[PDB]
């Protein structure tokens, strides 16, 4: 619509046209043909363990990273009960486990158990949201170091990582743990 | 709050610090000492009929006009039953009546009879709003020729005048017709 959110987002942030990178996706994940959506398999599929593939975390990256400027993309979470989204550094550990935290180069928030919204921080912070979002705007300002999440239907705030001193390229990152009927999808 | 509306308005538009100009105010209007608020008198007060004073329309202007750039200010309408706000050209007719319309250099919207939201256009357009606003953001982009009005509490759209070819300086303008307990006030 013509809400200040919808009208101004592109005046202020360049719209990322985020395409999921199948080379990065944990083998338990399915990337849609159009590369906009991700689902989970009952079992890991048989894929190479090429270096760019997350082999433990149920993660997938966008094809393109950012090293400067202002950028946004939107994700339809719909009625999923579990998801995490945000950005991560190019050089995160993709083989084995590391805690997904800003100290290990992940800046993400999401939902677990249907209704626990949280930042993936050390320690985890609980978010109290006016309503459950269906669509989440993810907003990067590389130079000020701000990663902001909004409800993309009413423009309400969800969370901001403030004043981070990024020194790596940053990828859109997505994680799904659960096997559910609703996918996680990028709006183009 | 940290809504996209509140966070982004100042990144994109310079906040006007709009002060009411008592020299411009129809003598039936009272301008507050702090020059942020306007009320109506039962009767016209005794004032000079200096050239900058609106002598028929129950109008008052901001002290400063714009000839370029992006600007905004916010107005608390509260539970008033009647008000109109927007911008007008420096050279509007201030002595006698002219219809307040874009053709006569007024770009305004507002409320009449408690619940008829309308643009002051020829002909008048009725606005259907999700909810009655309490605070209205007024947004000027001189070069693209856009004057946009938002609900300043949830960032929802109210109205836009699109692609106007301004060639005069533009003043914030305000009009109140009714005698009611609630004033019309500028947020600083």
Numbering used by the authors:
A (entry chain A), B (entry chain A): 18 to 205
Q: What did the study's authors say about this model?
A:
BTN molecules are composed of two Ig domains (IgV, IgC2), a single transmembrane domain, and a large carboxyl-terminal domain termed B30.2 (or PRYSPRY) located in the cell cytoplasm. More recently, the activation of human Vγ9/Vδ2 T cells has been linked to BTN3A1. Published reports show that BTN3A1 acts as an Ag presentation molecule for HMB-PP and IPP, but the mechanism remains poorly understood.
Therefore, we investigated the structure and binding interactions of the BTN3A1 B30.2 domain. The crystal structure, like that of the B30.2 domains of TRIM21 and TRIM5 (13), shows it to be composed of layered antiparallel β sheets with variable loops, a structure homologous to the Ig fold. The juxtaposition of B30.2 domain variable loop residues forms the specific binding interface. The BTN3A1 B30.2 domain structure has also been presented by Sandstrom et al., who identified a credible pocket implicated in binding pAg ligand, characterized by a cluster of positively charged residues. In addition to the residues highlighted by Sandstrom et al., particularly arginine residues at R412, R418, and R469, histidines H351 and H378 and the single lysine K393, our apo structure suggests a role in coordinating Ag for tryptophan residues W350 and W391. HMB-PP was found to bind with an affinity of 1.1 μM and IPP with an affinity of 672 μM, values that are similar to those reported and that help explain the 1000- to 10,000-fold difference in bioactivity of the two molecules on human γδ T cells. IFN-γ production from T cells was rescued by coculture with wild-type BTN3A1 and N115D re-expression, but not by the B30.2 domain variants H351R and W391A, nor by the Δexon5 and ΔLL deletions. In addition, the IFN-γ recovery response to HMB-PP by reconstituted wild-type cells was less efficient than for zoledronate. These data therefore provide functional confirmation of the critical requirement for the B30.2 domain, of key residues within this domain implicated in pAg binding and for the BTN3A1 periplakin interaction motif residues, in pAg-dependent activation of γδ T cells, with the likelihood that additional unidentified factors are required.
